[PDB]
Amino acid sequence: MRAGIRKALIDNIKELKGCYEPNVPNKDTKKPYMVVVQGQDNDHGETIGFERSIEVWIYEGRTTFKKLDKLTKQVVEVLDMNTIVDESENEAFTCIYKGTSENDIVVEEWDAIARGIRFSVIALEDKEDTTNDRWVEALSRHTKDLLEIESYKDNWKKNFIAPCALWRTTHIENKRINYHLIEITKTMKCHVVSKNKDEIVKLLETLETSLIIDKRVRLREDKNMYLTLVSVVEDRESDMFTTGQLTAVFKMIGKIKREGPTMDKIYGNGNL
Amino acid sequence: EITKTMKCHVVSKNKDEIVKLLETLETSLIIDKRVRLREDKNMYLTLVSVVEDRESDMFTTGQLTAVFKMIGKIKREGPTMDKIYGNGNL
Amino acid sequence: IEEASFLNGSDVVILIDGVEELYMEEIKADFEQDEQSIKLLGCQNEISRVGTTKGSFSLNGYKTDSKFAKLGFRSFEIIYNLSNSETLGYESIRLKNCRLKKLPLINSKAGEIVKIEVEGSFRGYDLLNE
Amino acid sequence: IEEASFLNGSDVVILIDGVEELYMEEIKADFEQDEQSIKLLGCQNEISRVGTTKGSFSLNGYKTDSKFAKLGFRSFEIIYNLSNSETLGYESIRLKNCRLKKLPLINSKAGEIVKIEVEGSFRGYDLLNE
Amino acid sequence: IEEASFLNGSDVVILIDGVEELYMEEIKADFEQDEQSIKLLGCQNEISRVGTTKGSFSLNGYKTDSKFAKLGFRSFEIIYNLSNSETLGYESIRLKNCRLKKLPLINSKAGEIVKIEVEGSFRGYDLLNE
Amino acid sequence: IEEASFLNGSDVVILIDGVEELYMEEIKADFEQDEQSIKLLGCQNEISRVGTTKGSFSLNGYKTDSKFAKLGFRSFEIIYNLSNSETLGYESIRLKNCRLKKLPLINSKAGEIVKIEVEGSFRGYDLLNE
Amino acid sequence: IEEASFLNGSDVVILIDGVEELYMEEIKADFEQDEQSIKLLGCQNEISRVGTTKGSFSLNGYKTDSKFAKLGFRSFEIIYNLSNSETLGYESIRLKNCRLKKLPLINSKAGEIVKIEVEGSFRGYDLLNE
User: Counting every residue, how long is chain A?
Assistant: 272
Under 8 Å between Cβ of F116 and F101: no
What backbone torsions phi and psi does residue B18 show, to the nearest 5 degrees?
Answer: -60, -45
d(CA C1, CA B77): 11
- Give the CA count within 13 Å in the CB-facing half-sphere of G38: 6
State how far the Cα of B37 lies from the Cα of B43, in Å rounded to an integer: 6
CA A48 to chain centre: 7
What Rg do the C-alpha atoms of chain E give, in angstroms?
Answer: 19
Cα(C65)–Cα(D91) distance, integer angstroms? 8
Distance from CA of F85 to the nearest CA of D (A): 12
- The residues facing F19 across adjacent strands are F16
Question: How far, CA to CA in Å, does B49 sit from each of B7, B44, B67, E111?
Answer: 11, 16, 5, 11
Q: Report the C-alpha gap between F106 and A133 in whole angstroms.
A: 57
Each as own residue / partner, the long-range contacts of residues E64-69 (CB below 8 Å, 24 or more positions apart, any chain) are E64/C4, E64/C5, E64/C6, E64/C7, E64/E22, E64/E23, E65/C89, E65/C91, E65/C130, E66/C91, E66/C127, E66/C130, E67/E16, E68/E100, E68/E103, E68/E104, E68/E116, E68/E118, E69/C93, E69/C127, E69/C130, E69/E103, E69/E104, E69/E105
- CA-to-CA distance for E53 and G100, rounded, in angstroms? 12
Q: How many CB pairs under 8 A join C and D?
A: 104
Q: Which helix (H) or strand (E) holds E88?
A: none
Going by the DSSP 8-state scheme, the letter that residue D10 receives in this structure is G
Q: Is E88 on the interface with A (CB under 8 A)?
A: no
* Phi, psi (degrees; rounded to nearest 5) at A251: -130, 165
Instruction: Give yes or no for a contact between A116 and A39, defined as CB atoms under 8 angstroms apart.
Output: no
Backbone angles phi, psi at A96, to 5 degrees: -110, 125
* Cα–Cα nearest to E82, from E8, E17, E22, E18: E8
Give the whole-angstrom CA distance, residue D24 versus residue D62.
6
> Rounded to an integer, what distance in angstroms lies between the CA atom of residue E33 and that of residue E30?
10
Cα separation, C21 vs C78, whole angstroms: 10
Work out the burial of residue C81: count CB atoms within 10 Å of its CB; fewer than 13 is exposed, 13-18 middle, 19 or more buried.
middle
Q: Tell me the resolution in Å.
A: 3.3
Alpha carbon separation from B48 to B9, B21, B31, C25 (Å, rounded)? 19, 20, 12, 17
Question: Residue C40: helix, strand or coil by DSSP?
Answer: coil
Burial class (CB in 10 A: 0-12, 13-18, 19+), F69: middle
Residue G14: name the closest of A163, C45, A179 by CA: A179
For residue D94, what are the CA distances in angstroms to C13, D10, F70?
A: 32, 18, 51
Separation of alpha carbons D124 and D33, rounded Å = 12
D18 min Cα distance to partner chain C (Å) = 18
Q: Which of A192, A176, A173 is nearest to A135 (CA)?
A: A173
Neighbours of B75 (CB within 10 A): 9
Please name every residue paired with C38 in a beta bridge, in sequence order, or none if there are none.
Answer: C47
Within its chain, how far is the Cα of F74 from the centroid? 16
Distances from the Cα of A123 to the Cαs of A93, A151, F93, in angstroms?
9, 15, 81
- The residue type of E118 is V
In 3D space, the residue among C63, A104, A141, C57 whose CA is nearest the CA of residue D82 turns out to be: C63
The secondary structure of residue D1, as a DSSP letter, is -
CB-CB neighbors (< 8 A) of C127 in chain E: 66, 69-70
CB burial readout A1-38, b (16+ within 10 A) else e: bbebbbbbbeeebeebbbbbeeeebeeeeebbbbbbee
- Tell how strand E75-82 and strand E12-16 pair up: antiparallel
Residue C69 has φ and ψ, to the nearest 5°, of -60, -40
Could you give the C-alpha distances from A213 to A207, A210, A247, C89, F60, in angstroms and in order? Answer: 10, 5, 16, 29, 58
Q: Peptide bond preceding A32: is omega within 30 degrees of 0, i.e. cis? A: yes
- Close Cβ partners of D36 (under 8 Å, ≥ 6 residues apart): D48, D49, D50, D51
Distance CA D103, CA D69 (A): 6
- Rounded Cα distance between A249 and F102, Å, is 55
Q: What is the dihedral of CA A84, A85, A89, A90, to 10 degrees?
A: 150
Residues 6+ apart with CB under 8 A from A38: A1, A2, A52, A53, A54
Whole-Å CA distances, D6 to A150, A175, C64, D82: 60, 52, 7, 11
- Distance from C-alpha of A137 to C-alpha of A167, rounded to nearest angstrom: 8
Category of E69 on φ-ψ map: left (φ > 0), alpha (ψ -120 to 50) or beta: alpha
Nearest to E65 by CA among C130, A241, A84, G45: C130
- Residue F93's identity, in one-letter code, is I
What stretch of H or E contains G20?
strand G19-21
Helix (H) or strand (E) holding D94: strand D91-100
Phi/psi of residue B22, nearest 5 degrees: -65, -40
Nearest to A237 by CA among A205, A201, A210, A203: A201
Going from the C-alpha of F91 to that of each of A39, B30, D108, F82, the distances in angstroms are: 83, 55, 12, 5
CB contact at 8 A, A96 and A119: yes
Of the CA atoms within 13 Å of residue D109, those in its CB half-sphere come to 6
Nearest partner of A183 among A260, A249, A258, A259, judged by Cα? A249
A163 cis-preceded (ω within 30 degrees of 0) = yes
- How close, in Å, is residue D3 to chain F by CA atoms? 33
Q: How many degrees, rounded to 5, is the angle at CA G69 between CA G65 and CA G73?
A: 140
DSSP element (H, E) containing G71? helix G67-71
Which H/E stretch holds residue C37? none
Q: Which of residues 40-99 of D touch F (CB under 8 A)?
A: 50, 52-54, 62-66, 69-70, 73, 99
Residue G122 CA to residue G97 CA, distance in Å, equals: 5
Strand intervals (E) in chain C: 12-16, 19-21, 24-33, 53-62, 76-82, 91-100, 102-109, 115-121, 124-126
- Write the single-letter amino acid at F42: G
8 Å CB contact between B69 and B85:
no
What span, in angstroms and rounded, lies between the C-alpha atoms of G82 and D81? 67
Q: What is the DSSP string of F6-57?
A: --BGGGEEEEETTEEE-SEEEEEEEEEE----B--SS-SB-B-----EEEEE
Which chain G residue lies closest to E84 (C-alpha atoms)? G64
Cβ contacts of C103 on chain D, cutoff 8 Å:
30-31
> Which DSSP string corresponds to chain A?
-HHHHHHHHHHH-SS--EEE-TT---TTPPSSEEEEEEEEEEE-HHHH-EEEEEEEEEEE-SS-HHHHHHHHHHHHHHHTT-EEEETTTTEEEE-EEEEE-SS-EEETTTTEEEEEEEEEE--SS------S-HHHHHHHHHHHHHH-SEE-TTS--TT--SSEE---EEEEEEE--SSSEEEEEEEEEE--B-SSHHHHHHHHHHHHHHHHHS-EEESSTTSS-EEEEEEEEE-TTS-TTTT-SEEEEEEEEEE-----------------
CA distance to D7, D12, D93, D114, G40, per residue, from C111 (Å): 11, 10, 20, 18, 57
CB contact at 8 A, D60 and D117: yes
Q: Do residue B33 and residue C2 have CB atoms under 8 angstroms apart?
A: no
Judge whether D31 is closer than 8 Å to chain F, CB to CB: no
Closest CA to G63 of G130, G97, G112, G28: G112
Question: Which of 15-34 (B) contact C at CB < 8 A?
Answer: 33-34
For residue D59, give the DSSP letter: E
Of A149, A153, A148, whose CA–CA distance to A135 is shortest? A153
- As to burial, measured by CB atoms within 10 angstroms (0-12 exposed, 13-18 middle, 19+ buried), residue B8 is middle
Instruction: Please count the other Cβ atoms lying within 10 Å of the Cβ belonging to residue A73.
Output: 11
Beta-carbon count within 10 A of B38 CB: 8
Separation between Cα atoms, residue C36 and residue C54, nearest integer Å: 14
Report the amino acid identity of residue E86. E
Q: What is the dihedral of CA A121, A127, A132, A134, to 10 degrees?
A: 60
Vertex E25: Cα angle to C95 and A216 (nearest 5): 160
Q: Is B84 on the interface with C (CB under 8 A)?
A: no
CA distance F57 to F76: 13
User: Which neighbouring-strand residues pair with E56?
Assistant: E30
* CB distance D44 to D66 below 8 Å: no
Burial zone of D86 (CB within 10 Å; 0-12 exposed, 13-18 middle, 19+ buried): exposed
Helix (H) or strand (E) holding E93: strand E91-100
CA B16 to chain centre: 28
Residue G114, SS3 per DSSP = coil
CA distance readout (Å), C42 to E34, E51, E98: 16, 12, 21
On chain D, the residues whose CB falls within 8 A of the CB of F125 are 105
Residues of E in contact with G105 (CB under 8 A): 29-31, 93, 95, 125
**Distance in angstroms (rounded) separating the CA atoms of residues D4 and F31:** 45
d(CA F15, CA F28): 14
How far is Cα of residue D41 from the mean position of the Cα atoms in its chain?
A: 40
What is the full DSSP assignment across B27-85? HHHHHS-EEESSTT-S-EEEEEEEEE-TTS-TTTT-SEEEEEEE-B-------------
Distance from C-alpha of C59 to C-alpha of E41, rounded to nearest angstrom:
55
Q: Which strand (E) or helix (H) includes residue B21?
A: helix B15-31
**C-contacting chains (≥3 CB pairs under 8 Å):** B, D, E
Q: Are strands A18-20 and A33-43 parallel, antiparallel or unpaired?
A: parallel
C-beta separation of G94 from G128 below 8 A: yes
DSSP designation for G73: T
**Broken C–N links (> 2.5 Å) in chain D, after residues:** none
Nearest Cα to Cα of residue D52 among C56, C98, C55, F48? F48
CB contact under 8 A, D64 and F5: yes
Q: Which residues of B touch C5 (CB under 8 A)?
A: 44, 71
Cβ atoms of residues D96 and D117 within 8 Å = no
The whole-angstrom distance between residue D96's C-alpha and the CA centroid of its chain comes to: 11
Cα separation, D60 vs G87, in Å, equals 59
The answer to whether E55 and E114 are in contact (CB under 8 A) is: no
The DSSP code for C18 is: T
Cα atoms found within 13 Å of the Cα of residue A59, Cβ hemisphere only: 21
Cα(A162)–Cα(A148) distance, rounded to whole angstroms? 12
Pick from D22, D99, D114: which is nearest to F7 by CB? D114
Q: To 10 degrees, the CA torsion angle through E42, E43, E46, E48?
A: -80
User: Within a 10 A sphere around the Cβ of A250, how many other Cβ atoms?
Assistant: 24
Angle of helix A65-79 relative to helix A2-12, nearest 10 degrees, comes to 120
Q: Given an 8 Å threshold on Cβ–Cβ distance, is E105 in contact with C31? A: yes
Cα dihedral A88, A89, A95, A99, rounded to 10, equals -70
**E77 and E17 in contact (C-beta within 8 Å)?**
yes
CA-derived radius of gyration, chain G: 19
